[PDB]
Design a protein around this ligand. Sequence first.
Ligand code: HEM
Ligand SMILES: COc1ccc(C(=O)O)cc1
Length: 393
Amino acid sequence: TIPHLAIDPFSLDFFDDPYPDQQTLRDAGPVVYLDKWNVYGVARYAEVHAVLNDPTTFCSSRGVGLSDFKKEKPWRPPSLILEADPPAHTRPRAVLSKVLSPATMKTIRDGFAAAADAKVDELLQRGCIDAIADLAEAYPLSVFPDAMGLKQEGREHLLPYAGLVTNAFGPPNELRQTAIERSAPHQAYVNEQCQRPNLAPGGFGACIHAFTDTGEITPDEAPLLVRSLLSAGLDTTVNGIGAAVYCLARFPGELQRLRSDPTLARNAFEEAVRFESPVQTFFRTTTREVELGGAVIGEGEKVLMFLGSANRDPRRWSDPDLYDITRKTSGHVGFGSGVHMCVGQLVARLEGEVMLSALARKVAAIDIDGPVKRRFNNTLRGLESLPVKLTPA
Ligand code: HEM
Ligand SMILES: COc1ccc(C(=O)O)cc1
């Protein structure tokens, strides 16, 4: 009853151009079996949404990567939020929700916006820049580590540690094994900065530790919650901002709409998250036999959710392969859905918004003027290099 496919969604050929194979996965049926890795897959919006919103049946505590924590030891101590289920997930989640809350955004927005304006001013003096290294990477690195309260030394470990985390979600292919092989210095730095004395007052890290006396988390749980923000707080924001610039360069008509109304900046970034989905995939593990889209899945089975495919499913979206900055993006799963829905989504949206705002007000044209190079990652989609010429407005 279940179609079996040989598509490897963690192969370089798939990463290079995933959209044909994603249509093949969607159109084969609501539930497929991927013979390459012995996992079930769901690529349509309907099933991805249903799986995300049943955390009891499709749990996260056995890992959201390929590895089943009931069978293999995790490569690091499990995340207290990403790799936990309710009720254990609930109170650590509440702490991170308050640390990255709407009220918190008010305290950082002025500085985040000023740094975005300053970066675009700087890039316009150069003219021809690399929109990844010089913009999508440079800007989040200039605001988020400071907002965490991290010292200056050792920050070069942050993006390599994130690449380790996201490649480690994948199967034991070369991308994963090579990341783990080189991991030791990046893990050592990150684990050390999670300790309370190393986090500057007022920052995200210090605020997590401050919650340890409310009864929501214990003192020994605070370092791992800081670890979550150091794991996830940068790489997808980089990829999302790079995706947005990529979209505005490929769809000049949408840049012109954004220039004419800079208040479209927030939705232009949200549409970029739907369109290029920085997080392509996450796994769940069945806790029981379950019927999903007319398919019977046994207990203890890994289910691969194609978030990027769900965000381009024509059963849900009109013209899904068009970048439309006034699209009603509500309901896309680029940040997930349900109880694990990205707790740092307000930070990512703030950075994306103020950067696209600076571009909307300061830049007249964005033209690719060099070879575009893709970055390969078992879990993330993003660019390695995006040479563009910025023309001032
Ligand atoms: C464009 C940027 C981002 C994207 C596309 C993204 C994507 C996602 C997705 C899809 C999930 C769901 C995980 C699941 O369902 O298993 C998630 C969760 C999470 N994200 Fe993000 N994220 C982004 C930015 C951030 C930022 C900036 C932070 C921290 C400052 C962050 C921290 C987290 C954490 C801690 C979780 C776990 C939440 C939970 O398990 O309850 N992310 N993210
Ligand atoms: C890629 O998204 C995430 C989310 C959470 C974590 C974590 O909690 O460690 C890591 C990566």
